[PDB]
Amino acid sequence: ELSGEMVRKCDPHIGLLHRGTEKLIEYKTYLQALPYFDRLDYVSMMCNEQAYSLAVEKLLNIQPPPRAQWIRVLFGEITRLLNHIMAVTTHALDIGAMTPFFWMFEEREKMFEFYERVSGARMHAAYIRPGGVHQDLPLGLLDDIYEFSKNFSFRIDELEEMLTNNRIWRNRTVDIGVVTAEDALNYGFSGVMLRGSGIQWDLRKTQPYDVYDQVEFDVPIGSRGDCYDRYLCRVEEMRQSLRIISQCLNKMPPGEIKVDDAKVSPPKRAEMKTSMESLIHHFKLYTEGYQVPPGATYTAIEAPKGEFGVYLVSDGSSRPYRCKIKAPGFAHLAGLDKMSKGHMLADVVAIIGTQDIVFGEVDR
Amino acid sequence: KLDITTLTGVPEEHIKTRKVRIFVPARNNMQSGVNNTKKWKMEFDTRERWENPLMGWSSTADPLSNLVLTFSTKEDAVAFAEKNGWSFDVEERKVPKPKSKSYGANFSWNKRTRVSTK
Amino acid sequence: ASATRVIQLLRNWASGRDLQAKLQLRYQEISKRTQPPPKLPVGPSHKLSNNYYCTRDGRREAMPPSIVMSSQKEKKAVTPAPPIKRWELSKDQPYL
Amino acid sequence: VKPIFSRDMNEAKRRVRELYRAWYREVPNTVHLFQLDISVKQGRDKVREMFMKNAHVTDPRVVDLLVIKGKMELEETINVWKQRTHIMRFFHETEAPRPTDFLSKFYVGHDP
Amino acid sequence: HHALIPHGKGGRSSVSGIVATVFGATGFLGRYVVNHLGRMGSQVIVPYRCEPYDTMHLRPMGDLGQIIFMEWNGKDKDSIRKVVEHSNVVINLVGREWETKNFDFEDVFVKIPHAIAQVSKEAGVEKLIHISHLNADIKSPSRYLRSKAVGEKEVRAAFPEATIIKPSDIFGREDRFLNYFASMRWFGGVPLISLGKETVKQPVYIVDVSKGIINAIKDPDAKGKTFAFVGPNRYLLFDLVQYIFAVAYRPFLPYLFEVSPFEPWTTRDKVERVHMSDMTLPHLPGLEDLGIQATPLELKAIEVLRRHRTYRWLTSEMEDVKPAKTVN
Amino acid sequence: RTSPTGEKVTHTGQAYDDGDYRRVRFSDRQKEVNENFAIDLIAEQPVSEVGSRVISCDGGGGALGHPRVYINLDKETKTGTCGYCGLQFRQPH
Amino acid sequence: LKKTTGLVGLAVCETPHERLKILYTKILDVLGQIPKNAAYRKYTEQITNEKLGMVKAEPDVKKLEEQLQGGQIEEVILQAENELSLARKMLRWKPWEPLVEEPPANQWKWPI
Amino acid sequence: DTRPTIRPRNDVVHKQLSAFGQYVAEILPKYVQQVQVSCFNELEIFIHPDGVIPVLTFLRDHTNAQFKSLADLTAVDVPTRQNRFEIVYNLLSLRFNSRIRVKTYTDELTPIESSVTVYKAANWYEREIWDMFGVFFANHPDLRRILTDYGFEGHPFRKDFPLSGYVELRYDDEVKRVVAEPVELAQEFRKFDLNSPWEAFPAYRQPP
Amino acid sequence: SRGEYVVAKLDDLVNWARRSSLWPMTFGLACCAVEMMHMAAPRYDMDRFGVVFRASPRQSDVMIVAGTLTNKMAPALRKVYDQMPEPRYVVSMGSCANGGGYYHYSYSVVRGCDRIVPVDIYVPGCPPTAEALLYGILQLQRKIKREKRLRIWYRR
Amino acid sequence: GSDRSRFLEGKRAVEDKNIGPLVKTIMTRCIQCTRCIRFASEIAGVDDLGTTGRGNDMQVGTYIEKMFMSELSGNIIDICPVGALTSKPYAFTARPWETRKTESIDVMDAVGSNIVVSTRTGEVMRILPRMHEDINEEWISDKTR
Amino acid sequence: TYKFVNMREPSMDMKSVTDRAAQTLLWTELVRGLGMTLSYLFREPATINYPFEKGPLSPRFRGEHALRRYPSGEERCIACKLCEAVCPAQAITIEAEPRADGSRRTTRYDIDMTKCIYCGFCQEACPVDAIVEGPNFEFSTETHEELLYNKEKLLNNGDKWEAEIAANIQADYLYR
Numbered sequence A: 001e002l003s004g005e006m007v008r009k010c011d012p013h014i015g016l017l018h019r020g021t022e023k024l025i026e027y028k029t030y031l032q033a034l035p036y037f038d039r040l041d042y043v044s045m046m047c048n049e050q051a052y053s054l055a056v057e058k059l060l061n062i063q064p065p066p067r068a069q070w071i072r073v074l075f076g077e078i079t080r081l082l083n084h085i086m087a088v089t090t091h092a093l094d095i096g097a098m099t100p101f102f103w104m105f106e107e108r109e110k111m112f113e114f115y116e117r118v119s120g121a122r123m124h125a126a127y128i129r130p131g132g133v134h135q136d137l138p139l140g141l142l143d144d145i146y147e148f149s150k151n152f153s154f155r156i157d158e159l160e161e162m163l164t165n166n167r168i169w170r171n172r173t174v175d176i177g178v179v180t181a182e183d184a185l186n187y188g189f190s191g192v193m194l195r196g197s198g199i200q201w202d203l204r205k206t207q208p209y210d211v212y213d214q215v216e217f218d219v220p221i222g223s224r225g226d227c228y229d230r231y232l233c234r235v236e237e238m239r240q241s242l243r244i245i246s247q248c249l250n251k252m253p254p255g256e257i258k259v260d261d262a263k264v265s266p267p268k269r270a271e272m273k274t275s276m277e278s279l280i281h282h283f284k285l286y287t288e289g290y291q292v293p294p295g296a297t298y299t300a301i302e303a304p305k306g307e308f309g310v311y312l313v314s315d316g317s318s319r320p321y322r323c324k325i326k327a328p329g330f331a332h333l334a335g336l337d338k339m340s341k342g343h344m345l346a347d348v349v350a351i352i353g354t355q356d357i358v359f360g361e362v363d364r
Numbered sequence B: 001k002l003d004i005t006t007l008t009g010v011p012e013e014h015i016k017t018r019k020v021r022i023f024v025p026a027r028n029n030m031q032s033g034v035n036n037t038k039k040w041k042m043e044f045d046t047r048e049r050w051e052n053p054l055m056g057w058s059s060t061a062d063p064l065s066n067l068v069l070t071f072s073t074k075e076d077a078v079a080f081a082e083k084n085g086w087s088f089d090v091e092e093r094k095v096p097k098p099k100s101k102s103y104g105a106n107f108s109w110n111k112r113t114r115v116s117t118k
Numbered sequence C: 001a002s003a004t005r006v007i008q009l010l011r012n013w014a015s016g017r018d019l020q021a022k023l024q025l026r027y028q029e030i031s032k033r034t035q036p037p038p039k040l041p042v043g044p045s046h047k048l049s050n051n052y053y054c055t056r057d058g059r060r061e062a063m064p065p066s067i068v069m070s071s072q073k074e075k076k077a078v079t080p081a082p083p084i085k086r087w088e089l090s091k092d093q094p095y096l
Numbered sequence D: 001v002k003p004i005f006s007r008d009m010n011e012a013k014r015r016v017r018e019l020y021r022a023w024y025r026e027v028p029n030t031v032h033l034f035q036l037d038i039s040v041k042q043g044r045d046k047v048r049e050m051f052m053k054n055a056h057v058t059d060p061r062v063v064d065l066l067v068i069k070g071k072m073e074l075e076e077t078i079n080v081w082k083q084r085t086h087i088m089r090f091f092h093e094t095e096a097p098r099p100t101d102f103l104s105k106f107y108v109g110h111d112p
Numbered sequence E: 001h002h003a004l005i006p007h008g009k010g011g012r013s014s015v016s017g018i019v020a021t022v023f024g025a026t027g028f029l030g031r032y033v034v035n036h037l038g039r040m041g042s043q044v045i046v047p048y049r050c051e052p053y054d055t056m057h058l059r060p061m062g063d064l065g066q067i068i069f070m071e072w073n074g075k076d077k078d079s080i081r082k083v084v085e086h087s088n089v090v091i092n093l094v095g096r097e098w099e100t101k102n103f104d105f106e107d108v109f110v111k112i113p114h115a116i117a118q119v120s121k122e123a124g125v126e127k128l129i130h131i132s133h134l135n136a137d138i139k140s141p142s143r144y145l146r147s148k149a150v151g152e153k154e155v156r157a158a159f160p161e162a163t164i165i166k167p168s169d170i171f172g173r174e175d176r177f178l179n180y181f182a183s184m185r186w187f188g189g190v191p192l193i194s195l196g197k198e199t200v201k202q203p204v205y206i207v208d209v210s211k212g213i214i215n216a217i218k219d220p221d222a223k224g225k226t227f228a229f230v231g232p233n234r235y236l237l238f239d240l241v242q243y244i245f246a247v248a249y250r251p252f253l254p255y256l257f258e259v260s261p262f263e264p265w266t267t268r269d270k271v272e273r274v275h276m277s278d279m280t281l282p283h284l285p286g287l288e289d290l291g292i293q294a295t296p297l298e299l300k301a302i303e304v305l306r307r308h309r310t311y312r313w314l315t316s317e318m319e320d321v322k323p324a325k326t327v328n
Numbered sequence F: 001r002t003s004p005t006g007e008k009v010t011h012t013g014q015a016y017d018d019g020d021y022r023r024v025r026f027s028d029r030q031k032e033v034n035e036n037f038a039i040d041l042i043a044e045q046p047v048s049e050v051g052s053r054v055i056s057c058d059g060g061g062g063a064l065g066h067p068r069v070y071i072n073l074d075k076e077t078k079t080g081t082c083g084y085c086g087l088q089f090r091q092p093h
Numbered sequence G: 001l002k003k004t005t006g007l008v009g010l011a012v013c014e015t016p017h018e019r020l021k022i023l024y025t026k027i028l029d030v031l032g033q034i035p036k037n038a039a040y041r042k043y044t045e046q047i048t049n050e051k052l053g054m055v056k057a058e059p060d061v062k063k064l065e066e067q068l069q070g071g072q073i074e075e076v077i078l079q080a081e082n083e084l085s086l087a088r089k090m091l092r093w094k095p096w097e098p099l100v101e102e103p104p105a106n107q108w109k110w111p112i
Numbered sequence H: 001d002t003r004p005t006i007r008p009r010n011d012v013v014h015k016q017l018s019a020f021g022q023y024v025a026e027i028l029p030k031y032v033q034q035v036q037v038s039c040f041n042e043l044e045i046f047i048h049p050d051g052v053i054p055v056l057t058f059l060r061d062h063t064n065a066q067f068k069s070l071a072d073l074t075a076v077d078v079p080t081r082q083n084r085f086e087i088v089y090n091l092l093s094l095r096f097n098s099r100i101r102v103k104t105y106t107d108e109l110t111p112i113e114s115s116v117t118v119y120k121a122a123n124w125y126e127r128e129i130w131d132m133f134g135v136f137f138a139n140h141p142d143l144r145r146i147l148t149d150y151g152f153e154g155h156p157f158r159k160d161f162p163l164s165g166y167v168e169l170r171y172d173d174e175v176k177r178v179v180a181e182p183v184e185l186a187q188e189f190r191k192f193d194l195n196s197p198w199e200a201f202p203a204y205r206q207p208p
Numbered sequence I: 001s002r003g004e005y006v007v008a009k010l011d012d013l014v015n016w017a018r019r020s021s022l023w024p025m026t027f028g029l030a031c032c033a034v035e036m037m038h039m040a041a042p043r044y045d046m047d048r049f050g051v052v053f054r055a056s057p058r059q060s061d062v063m064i065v066a067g068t069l070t071n072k073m074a075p076a077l078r079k080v081y082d083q084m085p086e087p088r089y090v091v092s093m094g095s096c097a098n099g100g101g102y103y104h105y106s107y108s109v110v111r112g113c114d115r116i117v118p119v120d121i122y123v124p125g126c127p128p129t130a131e132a133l134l135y136g137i138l139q140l141q142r143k144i145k146r147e148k149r150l151r152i153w154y155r156r
Numbered sequence J: 001g002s003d004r005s006r007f008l009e010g011k012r013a014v015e016d017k018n019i020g021p022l023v024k025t026i027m028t029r030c031i032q033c034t035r036c037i038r039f040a041s042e043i044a045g046v047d048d049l050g051t052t053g054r055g056n057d058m059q060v061g062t063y064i065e066k067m068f069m070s071e072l073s074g075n076i077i078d079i080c081p082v083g084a085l086t087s088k089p090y091a092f093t094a095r096p097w098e099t100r101k102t103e104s105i106d107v108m109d110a111v112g113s114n115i116v117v118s119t120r121t122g123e124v125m126r127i128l129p130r131m132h133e134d135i136n137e138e139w140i141s142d143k144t145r
Numbered sequence K: 001t002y003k004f005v006n007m008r009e010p011s012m013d014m015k016s017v018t019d020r021a022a023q024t025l026l027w028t029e030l031v032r033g034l035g036m037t038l039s040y041l042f043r044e045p046a047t048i049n050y051p052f053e054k055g056p057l058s059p060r061f062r063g064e065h066a067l068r069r070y071p072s073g074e075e076r077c078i079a080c081k082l083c084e085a086v087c088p089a090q091a092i093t094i095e096a097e098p099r100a101d102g103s104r105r106t107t108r109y110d111i112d113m114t115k116c117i118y119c120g121f122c123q124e125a126c127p128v129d130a131i132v133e134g135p136n137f138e139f140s141t142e143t144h145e146e147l148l149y150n151k152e153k154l155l156n157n158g159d160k161w162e163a164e165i166a167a168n169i170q171a172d173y174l175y176r
């Protein structure tokens, strides 16, 4: 409802990408349900798998091997770079700045190669699986990751050189979509939304998961709650992600990549073709699937767009009874009208960008 | 009697024509496990499954062909069928009778039970 | 990159940074696609003794949730957990 | 049991009549707004048909929820949230009529 | 030989056991015929001579592997053979209202129909549905109607049990009859021979004709019977055009194109056929015989002519034009 | 092999019959048929003679083959056939 | 003096000690209205007494913030306001009453 | 047990959560029906549906329970219970770095008080619950379909709703619009029975 | 003949223009849109081929359905498609757009965009790699190159 | 059981024995449970099956080449815990998880044996006994199967 | 642990104010950004010359599904159907009968690529390395029917791409 050029009531209509993923998950095994999570947030793929993997592991009362946890965090931060690149560049692209999109997307293409080198697929990997990771890193992958991260900092700085100080960019972001800290908490905002208003909350710090407790980084905190501060927060998150990536590349431990339980993680192909027990488990795990002990949990991680949680409900079978998916974008878009009050039409575009709304996760 | 039929959204054809069967699944004769045969289940009547001309894949128009609902007790299934207004046929659970077994009888002195080979 | 020294100088000056030091295009620092055959290790349970699954069956060691209180048949105030400690300002870069 | 909105069936019937009035008055505008090819009578006939479909209900709670759902459809229709196809979906057109005679069903297929 | 048991619920994924070769499917009546066959789940073999791009509209009308497009040539009998070999039903809709460089009214309405009928009988096709015109007459002056009747006789000779249908001025969204009148703006006012005061036409709805064709295929006694698809009411040409311009919000101004190498705007035969009052044959079965109930032009008039509105009649004023007087 | 209709018979013994309307799908398009019948190919493979009473076949290549299976050669008339590969092994007379 | 609270929408209070004391007194009175047996009253009175004693004891705002462990003193003021509103709502709700109704049969049984 | 396969369990958090659950139960005996802490340290409070607003308000405003963030509000459909739908509220307390779950029950007809007053995030969550499961929420600011189609009929996430649905969409040339027709699948979704006939977890065995 | 030669050459000229300067509209619906962006990213650079992303569907020639076409979005897709000017070509990217892919049996997913709009080129994958999508566009260009619209008009 | 194997030696292989045109026999998979022998000896009443040899070389089956003929022979397929005995018609046709089960009654005889019709993709794949202590217990005739 | 983005007070030194006003009036930062894009102009473009130049790919790449054969020439597929079960999109349809020889050879191995999600679970499940996703990503079709792959199509794809598929498996089987 626009008063000529002023936004009064911005009613967000969603469901244009509602594919009934949660119901489809219930009709499939836990392993078969993993690829669905890749699609949910089609910008951050492996991060989605990690949240689902942690939930299944928690119900399974198993622990992924130490190497896999470091591998998960390393690619998790690589995944965080992917989304932050996408969020900032596409937001700038909609605002009008088109050059930064192409500059950083080539780096995004390089990171996609890292996905394909370790999983065989560019975007959807299904690499982080409940119990660890599917395979070990291909020899030489870590070295190339170091090369990319070494030159990636310059690329982020080039982005800042073209946007951060630009007065037009500031005018389109500063004092736009300001959210009070109390409103953000009450409206269920998470991730950059909370940090943008100054709320010092980050799951990787407050509730460490995997080996995030064994890495050192800094949580960017906003001061004004406008789009510009959140833009700075997302940029700084990219910088701090490189810090985590460097640590992981220097601390990657030797070991296996899957939990050493052939009743949860499928045995190695050589073992499957030699051991009678391995073949039985390989047959059962891929046909029936591992039975998850009856129970329910809400495991949430600090996904690139915010808190990504999965309410997994297990009935003791190999297929989940109920899998509710907490999408950070869902709550953020619900508060779009509150943020859009007293703004112009162009401001709404900026507010959409600062919330990093992917309708795949919003419509689930 | 709760009448949720108007609120379910099920088409009228699949509210009246359907013949729900409340039953406890039988044990697969191939295996000896009985864990499957412990909860009541509700299934709908099977209907036509023709062949897709292009590939030969089986095609169906029954929307409720794959719907199987597990229920703790028979009364729960009956109530759920009544709520949704589906004609329901209930099969009483068949529990195997306790059978007296004696290993000694295999070596009986004057009984048929004596086994010829072990 | 295969650029003339003049072009390199102009590029660096316009950017304000030595771009030749960190060129985005990958030339030779890339790892060889063909790699030596790997030998992945075995897990902690790849042993011929003291490997009974009963001692490592975490899936079967899960228990039903403990019922603290059920309506069906001076204490101090209790918080859900100790209050969160104030975060400390970063020492590498306090203010961006 | 807590009533949804109406404690008695008479109260529920009051809500039903209120909804029927709104639908009856909205039909002419709806035909104009979506440029439907149905007549105003046709739309009002469909409205009455839809109301008469759920005419066997006796629980006030169920009637309340039916009215709520009826309101929601009206809100979308009034706010042009629905599209032209959405409004026409009420008037099943392409769907071939399925016969009711047993002999006809016998010829048609194995339909039970 | 090619007899298929129908299986399914009559939906898109069902099997109706109707392998049909709809000749001239890329046409006004062709689309609706294919759509009805497709929605029932029939193997619609589409012979086409135009660009495949022009046939894309028929692709979404059927399920996977149900609409098969194969090139055919009206001058090649072999092309007709390979397109009707496995078909159990063949529907002939090939007809152009204007003669072309390489195709004359004789070729389109005699030679091509006869070749189709002859080949279909040799192939063993169970039923053939030829589409004539109600005003087709052996001694009719217009070449269109005269040639159509000539081919009709030859169709019966080659295909003895052919089910010949004779529609009368089919109208619909992509029709050349209602839209043609509403296009009189290009032709000055409303060119009407003698103000079109001696011509009464009986227009038939497009879906009614298409449904009748499908019903005729299913009908076991329709074989060998010459059906005549008539409209619900007979309208005076002047009144009909007045009604057309009325719902089209067009000023009614009651008042060479063959030369055009691109699709001629107007044909001399078309002009004669327009001013020729529709015949009335009460000795032939009609839509009611096939069960289809004729739909009045009034109900479906707006769907065809609202799109021809000028400024503010599809909204705002939206004056309702009463039904035009019918000469019945 | 080719059917009397002229349609090449697949190794699955499938060939659209003359009365089959579905044969129209290959009117202007070729019928994809694999031209290396597997059953014939193994028949070409010679029967190995191994003196041991029990032999094990992995299909060759170790982890690139099939689950190792042990075959018994007591039967004199019959030749031990691999369950997965299908290779035939015999005990020298 | 603190320039800003950091959190957007939260303003620095020039007289935090006095404000906290007044709010705590209001809270204590409202809890006094609550029946003594109610656990809410007992626990909340304990907490408020602790906080009020610390507020009166420590005059330094920063040391008081560290002592209360409730974050910035403005955040503590907000917490006090929330607690007071909750106490009034509790007086309305009377949650110290017995259970409304036991769960029907096995309403909390998993797996089925 | 020990060794990498088993997941390490922290007993301290278990004790803390149990104590806080008892705390909440004592403060709210009127509504709290049962308190459970899972072995993976997740406190769950079961509350009578009438107590949705009071219990949440206590868990949000109380100084020692500052759960000011509605992480996720969902529903679980168990058809074997009279109150088939189970409304579950997931909360987060930043002050104490903890989470809690409020689980309530409801029927297909009994309304549930909207928690929009407690948490503004509840708006869209409750809209989704109503759209997918059909749980009406009383005093809701705008309760309407949020995820399904505008003219959709039925609640999809209900266990009795078919996975493929009852209706399908396609474009029809005759009507020149996208039309809804009864669902007909070329390949029926192949139901796979995977449940093993042998019991897997003795700890969760229901005695006959 | 000379007439055929003139018509054929003119038809080739028209075909060249359209295939060289194809203007696609990004109907990005789901995950496949991301790979479509990577196609326009510097590494592949669809613009190098003359394929420039035309935001305005009224000035577009190719509709790249990239993502899962839900029932709610289905009417919009067709309505946008018929508002496209001709010649108009539809390229289905991704298994979800092709036949529903992962959500084929979903209650609110169209079983392929082919039902709603006629499709010319189907790009397989989930998501199809940017080269595969680029390969599909080049295949569409070759498809346009084979078109003989004028020749058929002359030979009619 | 456990999740891995310590058997570093070579496995044994047993020559298969033909017992008829209905029960496909792969004795390499036999676990020497003696269920088939006991069933043949007591329920079927045909004393043909037995153990030959001793130790790890103990083979189960008729010592001579004899066909196990019985009207209830098919049930030995069901009793066999492992896939040593498999239905020859049903062999290689389908897997258990995909087959849909429909409880039914046999009509070949007037016993009224309860059967489970395993159908996949709208095609009867196999017929399995349904437990009914009063009529067919756990066995069905070979004709019925 | 936490870093303050923004949160930087501006100095009111007359020199600092002068430089800030200079930035505002003389548009210095805009010129800086303009120079950055100009620098990007003189860099080397990263566009590969498709299809003459192909993008980098790893041996683990997942693409067109393909049915493989043993070196003897027998189809590896022994109709276990577990790849059909594991398939998260239910795209594989397998029907098998005892072959004339007597082995488990499928009579129908149909996978609709239009429904497959190219996850790779099928190749990870197959116990004989029969179904393996190949390296071909460029197999776009013009008709929907073509995407639905028959068993014959899969066998032909395996025969065509066998060299590369075998090489990639040999280069990756150790990791798996």
Ligand SMILES: NC(=O)C1=CN([C@@H]2O[C@H](COP(=O)(O)OP(=O)(O)OC[C@H]3O[C@@H](n4cnc5c(N)ncnc54)[C@H](OP(=O)(O)O)[C@@H]3O)[C@@H](O)[C@H]2O)C=CC1
Residues within 6 Å of the ligand: E023, E024, E025, E026, E027, E028, E029, E030, E031, E048, E049, E050, E074, E092, E093, E094, E095, E096, E097, E103, E108, E131, E132, E133, E134, E166, E167, E168, E169, E170, E171, E176, E177
């Ligand atoms: N109102 C009416 O239109 C009435 C028409 N009829 C007759 O019924 C049929 C209806 O045709 P309709 O569907 O409306 O299509 P149109 O008359 O609008 O278009 C011509 C149709 O005939 C085909 N056609 C014409 N000439 C040739 C040719 N030389 N070779 C091959 N195909 C050809 C066209 O296919 P293509 O474009 O590929 O050449 C197209 O299908 C025609 O036979 C018509 O004469 C009878 C009564 C009323």
Ligand code: SF4
Residues within 6 Å of the ligand: A039, I030, I031, I032, I066, I067, I068, I093, I094, I095, I096, I097, I101, I102, I125, I126, I127, I128, K117
């Ligand atoms: S095909 Fe795959 S990547 Fe593309 S929209 Fe569908 S799920 Fe997403």
Ligand code: SF4
Residues within 6 Å of the ligand: J029, J030, J031, J032, J033, J034, J035, J036, J037, J060, J079, J080, J081, J082, J084, J085
């Ligand atoms: S029933 Fe089977 S496993 Fe048991 S002894 Fe007989 S053949 Fe061996």
Ligand code: SF4
Residues within 6 Å of the ligand: A280, J029, J081, J082, J083, J084
């Ligand atoms: S399925 Fe059972 S009987 Fe067959 S080989 Fe495996 S473990 Fe042995």
Ligand code: SF4
Residues within 6 Å of the ligand: K076, K077, K078, K079, K080, K081, K082, K083, K084, K094, K125, K126, K127, K128, K129, K130, K131
């Ligand atoms: S998993 Fe391998 S062996 Fe089994 S059916 Fe599939 S392709 Fe054949």
Ligand code: SF4
Residues within 6 Å of the ligand: K065, K086, K087, K088, K089, K091, K092, K111, K115, K116, K117, K118, K119, K120, K121, K122, K123, K133
């Ligand atoms: S790769 Fe994935 S989608 Fe493709 S056939 Fe294998 S399991 Fe199915």
